[PDB]
Amino acid sequence: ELDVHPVAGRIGAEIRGVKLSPDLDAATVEAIQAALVRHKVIFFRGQTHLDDQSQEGFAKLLGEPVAHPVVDGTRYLLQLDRANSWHTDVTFVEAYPKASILRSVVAPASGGDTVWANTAAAYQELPEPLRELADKLWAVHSNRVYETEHPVVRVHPISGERALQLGHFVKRIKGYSLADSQHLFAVLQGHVTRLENTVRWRWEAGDVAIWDNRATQHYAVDDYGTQPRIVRRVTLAGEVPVGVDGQLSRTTRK
Amino acid sequence: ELDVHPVAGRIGAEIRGVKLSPDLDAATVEAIQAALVRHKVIFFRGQTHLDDQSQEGFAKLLGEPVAHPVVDGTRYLLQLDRANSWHTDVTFVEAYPKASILRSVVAPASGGDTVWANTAAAYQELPEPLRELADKLWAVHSNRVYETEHPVVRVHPISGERALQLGHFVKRIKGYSLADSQHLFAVLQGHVTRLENTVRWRWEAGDVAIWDNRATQHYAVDDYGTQPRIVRRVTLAGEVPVGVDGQLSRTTRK
Amino acid sequence: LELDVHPVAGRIGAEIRGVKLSPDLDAATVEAIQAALVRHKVIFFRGQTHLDDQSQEGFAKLLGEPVAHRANSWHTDVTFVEAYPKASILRSVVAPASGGDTVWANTAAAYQELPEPLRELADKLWAVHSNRYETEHPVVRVHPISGERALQLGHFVKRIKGYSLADSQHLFAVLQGHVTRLENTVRWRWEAGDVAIWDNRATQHYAVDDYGTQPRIVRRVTLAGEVPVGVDGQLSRTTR
Amino acid sequence: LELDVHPVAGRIGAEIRGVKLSPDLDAATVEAIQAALVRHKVIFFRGQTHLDDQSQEGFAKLLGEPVAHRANSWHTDVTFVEAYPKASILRSVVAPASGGDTVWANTAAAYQELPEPLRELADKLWAVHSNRYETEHPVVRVHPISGERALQLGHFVKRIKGYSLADSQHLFAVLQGHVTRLENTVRWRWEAGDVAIWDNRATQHYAVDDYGTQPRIVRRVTLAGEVPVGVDGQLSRTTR
Ligand SMILES: CCCC[C@@H](CC)COS(=O)(=O)O
Ligand SMILES: CCCC[C@@H](CC)COS(=O)(=O)O
Ligand SMILES: CCCC[C@@H](CC)COS(=O)(=O)O
Ligand SMILES: CCCC[C@@H](CC)COS(=O)(=O)O
Ligand SMILES: O=C(O)CCC(=O)C(=O)O
Ligand SMILES: O=C(O)CCC(=O)C(=O)O
Ligand SMILES: O=C(O)CCC(=O)C(=O)O
Ligand SMILES: O=C(O)CCC(=O)C(=O)O
Ligand SMILES: [Fe+2]
Ligand SMILES: [Fe+2]
Ligand SMILES: [Fe+2]
Ligand SMILES: [Fe+2]
């Protein structure tokens, strides 16, 4: 039983009384993994003891770190020093990351928030006929150099929850003209970013966020001007998405 | 066997060698009714003998004329002397007209066309998952004083063909926010008005058009300035629309 | 005075500390509050648990003239009338344990960030606002104190005057999408005793409805405002 | 000359009778054709069954300099290059019995009908056209003969320069929706031997793909055009 404090009504929770480290016991790790599946994004404040090697070793307890170049003295640590567009991380590849662990090193005095959206709540709130349509759709994601076909709805490998898989890397919905694709995307993506499905975090140096990349999107707010902002992320390797009918994503260009 | 000449690839046919009148035989009438179901809109040129009473008596052979005020010396004849918005006639009511018979009395030397769209071809061309969604949708039509709920897809009482029922009188798709309704309408209505599904007619005095209002929309082009344009229409009473599941439209405000 | 002012987001919103609101604040404090408000668009005071209905109304009276009349849709208060409120003062009486946030958007920053050709078009537009009263307001208002131009849009807008429905919808979507762009907003998570005051001339706001059946009770005093002036000096007008 | 000219739709398109096209037309006829073209945007000659490949090319040569390089999408020909064609001459060799029409839109009428604030914004926009060559063209072109302003948009447009993707899409949808509004268009049903010539500086067109496997064969000569000039006198420029 962790000290868990929900931040918004439908997503997000701060976990208190825990100091992250490469030496956490299996029970704390398990309770972290469960809070993560349930809340989609979790927050840990005052992790000021943490450093590059230590963040990477903590990460190792949650899954297998994977390269996205990297921070020096590390194998896996990525620095961001602006991602102000809604997106799920790396969906242009087949088995994109399952989770990301992000630590604030330098935090602007004003601005520099991050927002997450719960794509499983977004799916559940759709009227039934629209869920049934979403269940059937496939989208081409691209970093334009990769192009991957993913189902629009993914069945979460642990919870079994269905979640929308959309975001900035989507180039089009397969089977549809450009105009129709744009309208279908706008409806479904509009439900992901509806404010009720989101939580916004104001960072302080030493804050750590971990989110389930299988069931969120996120957005870094670029309102901080020339104030320094440095964050460091470890990303954890994920599985091939499974659609509602059991079909699997497939990379189609490389 | 009428002399039938298709005008566009997917809708519209001119019928030659026939002089419309209140005295046409059951066979000619039947062959006209069939060309109408098949082609959605049919055209008869050189009907210069026709007049108000005679148009009304011809109409009587095709169904039951119904008031939409009316042209004098007639019970049913409506004059239009500008409908430049895509629409199916009177869908704000439950049992809107099944067909309309329109005669050109004064025809601009340039401009003043009418265009029809085949809403059955529009339905058939949708990808299957989108047809399945359309099969489930209901829309509120309104003359804002009536409000009627119609299924978005109507099963044609004679052909059994499914056709989209949308157009200018739709206020919203029931069950959806305003934003989502607007996107869903734009996709489905965009397929109705796609040029391939339409036929445009340039009028000459004495031209007569008859169209199946259960499976078209139409639009009067307002490009003729102050050139006189007078047309006279008789409209024929229609049935209550049946949806794919057998549900019936219902007026909900009066 | 120099107030203890702590900006919340980069382009809007500031918490003011070391002030206990009351009907007895001095002219200097009230002036410094009015200035922070103009500057930051929405300002927050925490720990105002001594405050009550009568006391909120008396404090409000120092900032302007109070005026009689789940909001999860972006809006500027009462823009369906001619001289809609200049400001609102909102106190949290009961705050849900999770959810129940309010977001504000800075419509002056939204205007300034438009490319120049787009700002010029905005400066010419008028919109019809309605509570279906119907009032015509300029899409761009010149703020009577700062002279800052701000977009006047939101949920009460029925159409942009002089355009087809389709064009109106596209034009509204561009300008309103700038207002609600995350960069121009601030989200506040309420605690009982928090008070927010915002400049209704240069914001919109949205009450997030993510708290289910948790109790939530807030009390608002609204302050009377002026008739909007457009960039060319024309005035808003009620038409129905 | 005074040609026998019969307008097809109210705002674009005219059939010219009593003329048999050929490489031997006199300067007066050619001038009167050039004038009808400028005025009506697209002109039609029926019954040109004597014409053949060599004869079409020779006739074309009287109207400008010929230039080497199912189109059911609205477009202006080759706008992905700097000096795209000023005109095209198109002959129907085989015409399907039903379907196979072509539609043209008058982009000068589309510009003129915009409300004034919208025309002013259009006069400032630039767009990137691409055949994915990438060329920057002004959204509004000043026609080198008539001085008429016309919208330069259509299927080759990738984005409006200086705007986000979402804004670009809204702005393109408003301006392009005016181009394709039915009132600004004319649809021609072809017969073998019909010839259409259009002013590619002030139109778009669309070939309707409703004829299935019916044979359809058309032959086009295209005439070289100038670099577009915007309202401020800037020039289009290829950038990739
Ligand atoms: C602007 C959107 C890009 C977001 C980036 C941050 C550099 C996230 O990259 S990702 O790991 O490939 O998803
Ligand atoms: C502008 C759209 C209205 C179209 C009208 C013509 C007056 C058709 O009226 S209808 O018979 O109620 O459908
Ligand atoms: C749904 C948004 C409407 C907001 C209402 C609350 C019912 C209050 O705002 S106001 O009428 O502009 O003062
Ligand atoms: C789909 C529209 C493209 C039109 C092509 C035909 C493949 C011709 O137009 S052009 O390249 O601008 O000359
Ligand atoms: O900068 C942030 O807050 C998040 C950036 C981002 O998208 C990521 O690291 O996945
Ligand atoms: O004026 C026309 O061509 C048709 C007008 C119309 O919509 C109708 O009569 O149903
Ligand atoms: O309940 C809120 O948070 C704001 C509601 C609202 O729109 C108002 O009080 O003006
Ligand atoms: O085939 C047509 O009708 C026109 C095709 C086309 O776009 C062209 O020739 O420029
Ligand atoms: Fe990311
Ligand atoms: Fe009609
Ligand atoms: Fe409000
Ligand atoms: Fe072309």
Q: What is the dihedral of CA B131, B132, B137, B141, to 10 degrees?
A: 20
> Which approach determined this entry?
X-ray
Decide: residue A101, CB within 10 A, 0-12 exposed, 13-18 middle, 19+ buried: buried
Q: Mind spelling out the 3-state secondary structure of A5-32?
A: EECCCCCCEEEECCCCCCCCCHHHHHHH
Query: Which of D71, D90, D119, D105 is closest to D219 using CA atoms?
Result: D90
The residues near A177 (Cβ < 8 Å, ≥ 6 apart) are none
* Integer Cα distance of C38 and C63 in angstroms: 12
H helix or E strand, kind and range, residue D108:
helix D107-113
Q: What CATH number is associated with residue D218?
A: 3.60.130.10
The β-bridge relationship of strands C195-199 and C42-45 is antiparallel
Amino acid identity of D134?
E
B83 lines ligand 6 (CB under 6 A): yes
Determine the atom of ligand 2 nearest the C-alpha atom of B84: 1
Query: Which of B127, B231, B145 is closest to B187 using CA atoms?
Result: B127
How many angstroms is the resolution? 2.1
C75 lines ligand 3 (CB under 6 A): yes
Q: Is A144 helix (H, G, I), strand (E, B) or coil?
A: coil
* Integer Cα distance of D122 and D139 in angstroms: 6
For residue D163, give the nearest of C115, C167, C170 by CB distance.
C115
The β-bridge relationship of strands B153-155 and B162-164 is antiparallel
Strand order in the sheet with B250-253: B170-173, B138-142, B147-151, B250-253
Asked if D125 and C117 come within 8 Å (Cβ–Cβ), the reply is: yes
Chains that touch C (3 or more CB pairs under 8 A): A, D
What does the longest C-alpha to C-alpha distance in chain A come to? 52
How is residue D106 written in tokens?
A: 């008058």
Looking at CA atoms only, how far is residue A102 from chain C in angstroms?
20
* Integer Cα distance of B49 and C138 in angstroms: 57
Residues having CB closer than 6 A to ligand 1 are: A 68, 80, 83, 85, 87, 89-90, 168
Number of H helices, E strands in chain B: 5, 16
The residues near D52 (Cβ < 8 Å, ≥ 6 apart) are none
Would you say the C-alpha torsion A207, C101, A9, C153 has a positive or negative sign?
Answer: negative
Give, in order, the Cα–Cα distances in Å from C86 to each of B53, C22, C144, C154, C222. 65, 20, 10, 16, 8
SS3 content of chain D, % helix, strand, coil (to 5): 25, 30, 45
CB atoms within 10 A of CB D3: 16
Q: Is D47 left (phi over 0), alpha (psi -120 to 50) or beta?
A: left
**Got the DSSP string for D119-165?**
HHHHTT-EEEEE---EEEEESEEE-TTT--EEE--STTEEEETTS-H
How is residue D18 written in tokens?
A: 């009593």
B220 lines ligand 6 (CB under 6 A): yes
The phi and psi torsions of B141 (rounded to 5 degrees) equal -100, 150
For residue D210, give the nearest of B10, B111, B200 by CB distance.
B10
Question: Domain of C44?
Answer: 1-240
Find residue D218's DSSP bridge partners: D92
* Integer Cα distance of C226 and C236 in angstroms: 10
Q: How many domains does chain D have?
A: 1
CB atoms within 10 A of CB B222: 18
Distance A114 CA to ligand 7 centre (A): 24
* Integer Cα distance of C201 and C151 in angstroms: 9
